């Protein structure tokens, strides 16, 4: 209609084969529906209906290009990325046919309880699959730029995960200087300051997600870009002086003496000058309930893995291979 979204009807047949029976969620970047393919023995499929407007039309065609490249590079489907079956058009809207996947990780956490999180064994298996998805993204020279529980889907048995939504995705050479890239809570410090970014932004997002997967709550629930840096510095201390100078938007958060400018509400803004930020955030205490040694040792290994991921400088950040060979996964 006026906004761009398609008015989906239950019982409607798309591309003379896809009989729509139910809705998945429908918010969203591009509305998704559940359908049965009558041309393929009524087998279940997920249809993503891309918005009619030119803003999302270019986004949909870009997503179609990225999904094709990632699927062709992974024929055996071992690098945990969403599989695109085919594409078609319906009433001016681009429609993408995908795997019949159950739900996203944000929906799984809601069913687990308020600040409960998943089991350490599931978090371990999910980590490896998330790192395997990062390996394929790096090989294809693609940045996801939106890794979060909402964009990670699971099968009915919840044993296999698949990374979805390649709408905000981009190529390495096609890098843009923007501090609003990646969903705020999963945004890497290099994006905020305006430093040259690469695959490390996807690694940072996985780290934020893995903490949320076990704790059931957001790691850095920052209201603004400035508050995001403060919460990140509450764990690993003050950002290195060499990193600050390399950033384009350094003046918005730091001064000439390389000191952080913390913005606080009340209602007018109050700037607090900080020469040094002492690490106050206890990542171990936040992770732990206190249960048996078999689980206790695994939680401590996740803490060490998170410390290696949550490094402010992307050059001093853990690699994909090291993350896969880490003690937390190898058990
Ligand atoms: N939003 C997207 O880009 C995509 C979402 C999906 C999905 C789904 C995402 C969310 C789905 C869904 O049904 N969510 C609601 C929900 C909540 C709790 N339990 C169940 Cl069984 C379903 S399906 C499946 C396959 C491909 C794609 S692409």
Domain harbouring 326, CATH code:
1.10.510.10
Task: Give all strands (DSSP E) within the chain, no chain letters.
Answer: 13-14, 18-23, 32-37, 43-49, 84-90, 93-98, 103-104, 142-143, 152-154, 161-163, 170-171, 260-264, 270-274
Return the best residue to mutate from 82, 101, 148, 169 for the ligand 1 pocket (most ligand atoms within 8 A of CB).
Answer: 101
End-to-end Cα separation, the chain, in angstroms: 53
Q: How far is CA 16 from CA 90, 187, 305, 311, in A?
A: 10, 42, 49, 51
Report the Cα 253 to chain-centroid distance in Å: 25
The resolution of the experimental structure, rounded to one decimal in Å, is 2.2
* Residues 184, 128 share a domain: yes
- Considering the domain architecture, whether residues 129 and 19 belong to the same structural domain is answered as no
- Residue 219, Cβ neighbours under 10 Å: how many? 22
DSSP 8-state symbol, 319? P
Is residue 92 packed enough to be buried (19+ CB in 10 Å), middle (13-18) or exposed (0-12)? Answer: exposed
Return all residues near 120 (Cβ < 8 A) that are at least 6 apart.
214, 295, 298, 299, 302
CA distance 101 to 68: 18
Distance 102 CA to ligand 1 centre (A): 6
- Considering the domain architecture, whether residues 204 and 291 belong to the same structural domain is answered as yes
Q: 315 and 205 share a domain?
A: yes
Contact between 46 and 33 (Cβ < 8 Å): yes
Atom of ligand 1 at shortest distance to CA of 167?
3
Q: Domain check: are 134 and 82 in the same one?
A: yes
- Distances from the Cα of 265 to the Cα of 75, 220, 223, 269, angstroms: 52, 18, 11, 5
Closest to 81 (Cα-Cα) out of 198, 168, 164? 164
Domain stop point among 11, 40, 74: 74
Give, using CA atoms, the residue closest to atom 3 of ligand 1: 165
Same domain, yes or no: 100 and 163: yes
- Going by alpha carbons, the residue nearest to atom 5 of ligand 1 is 32
Strand, coil or helix: 86? strand
In Å, how far are 132, 135, 197, 320 from 139, measured between CA atoms? 11, 6, 16, 11
- Give the domain-ending residue among 28, 56, 74: 74
Q: Which of 80, 49, 219 is nearest to 153 (CA)?
A: 80
Residues 276, 130 within the same domain: yes
Token pair recorded at residue 87: 């594409």
Q: 124: how many CB neighbours lie within 10 A of its CB?
A: 20
For residue 64, which of 36, 39, 90, 89 has the smallest C-alpha distance?
A: 89
> Could you list the residue range(s) of the whole structural domain that residue 226 is in?
75-331
Q: How many domains does the chain have?
A: 2
Residues 107 and 190 in one domain: yes
Q: Give the integer Cα–Cα distance in Å for 207 and 326.
A: 14
Give the residue, by CA position, lying nearest to ligand 1 atom 2. 165
Say how far residue 101 (Cα) sits from the centre of its chain: 17
What is the sign, positive or negative, of the torsion defined by CA atoms of 293, 296, 301, 304?
A: negative
* 70 alpha carbon, distance to own chain's centre: 17
Do 186 and 165 meet the contact criterion of CB atoms below 8 Å apart?
no
Residues 271 and 301 in one domain: yes
| Annotated catalytic residue, options 146, 150, 165, 202 | 146
Helix (H, G, I), strand (E, B) or coil at 253: coil
* Residue 128 and residue 1 share a domain: no
φ/ψ of 44, rounded to 5, equals -70, 140
Question: Ligand 1 test: best mutation among 153, 156, 166, 183, most atoms within 8 Å of CB?
Answer: 153
Q: Give Cα 21 to chain centroid, integer Å.
A: 29
Are residues 64 and 167 in contact, defined by beta-carbon separation less than 8 angstroms?
Answer: no
The tokens describing 117, both together, are 């999180």
Way the structure was solved: X-ray
What's phi and psi for 143, nearest 5 deg?
-105, 125
Known active-site residue 146: yes
CATH number of 47's domain: 3.30.200.20
Q: Which of 57, 74, 91 is the last residue of a domain?
A: 74
Give yes or no for residue 24 CB within 6 A of ligand 1: yes
* Cis check: omega of the bond before 24, within 30 degrees of 0: no
Asked whether the beta carbons of 329 and 298 are under 8 A apart, the reply is: no
Per the annotation, where are the binding residues for ATP? 24-32, 48
Do 67 and 180 belong to one domain?
Answer: no
Query: Do 191 and 87 share a domain, yes or no?
Result: yes
Q: Using an 8 Å Cβ cutoff, are 193 and 243 in contact?
A: yes
């Amino acid at each position: 209609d006026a906004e761009g979204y398609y008015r989906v009807n239950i019982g409607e047949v798309l591309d003379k084969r896809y009989n729509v029976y139910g809705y998945t969620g429908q918010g969203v970047f591009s509305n998704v529906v559940r359908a049965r393919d009558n041309a393929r023995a009524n087998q279940e499929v997920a249809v993503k209906i891309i918005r009619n407007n030119e803003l999302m039309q270019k986004t949909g065609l870009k997503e179609l290009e990225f999904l094709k490249k990632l699927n062709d590079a992974d024929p055996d489907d071992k690098f945990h990325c969403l599989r695109l079956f085919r594409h078609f058009y319906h009433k001016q809207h681009l429609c993408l046919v995908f795997e019949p996947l159950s739900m996203n990780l944000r929906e799984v956490l809601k069913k687990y309880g308020k600040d409960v999180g998943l089991h350490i064994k599931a978090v371990r298996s999910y980590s490896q699959q998330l790192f395997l998805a990062l390996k394929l993204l790096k090989r294809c020279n693609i940045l996801h730029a939106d890794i979060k529980p909402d964009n990670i889907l699971v099968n009915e048995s919840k044993t296999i995960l698949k990374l979805c939504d390649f709408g905000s995705a981009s190529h390495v050479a096609d890098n843009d200087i923007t501090p609003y890239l990646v969903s705020r809570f999963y945004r890497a410090p290099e994006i905020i300051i305006g430093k040259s970014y690469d695959y490390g932004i996807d690694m940072w997002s996985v780290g934020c997600t893995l903490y949320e997967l076990y704790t059931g709550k957001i790691l850095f629930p920052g209201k603004t870009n400035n508050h995001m840096l403060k919460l990140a510095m509450d764990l690993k201390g003050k950002m290195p002086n060499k990193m600050i100078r390399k950033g384009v938007f350094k003046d918005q958060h730091f001064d000439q003496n390389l000191n952080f400018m913390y913005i606080e509400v009340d209602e007018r803004e109050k700037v607090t000058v900080m020469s040094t930020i002492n690490p106050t955030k206890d990542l171990l205490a936040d992770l732990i309930q206190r249960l048996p040694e078999d689980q206790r040792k695994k939680v401590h290994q996740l803490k060490d893995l998170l410390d290696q991921i949550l490094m402010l400088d992307p050059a001093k950040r853990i690699s994909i291979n090291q993350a896969l060979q880490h003690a937390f996964i190898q058990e």
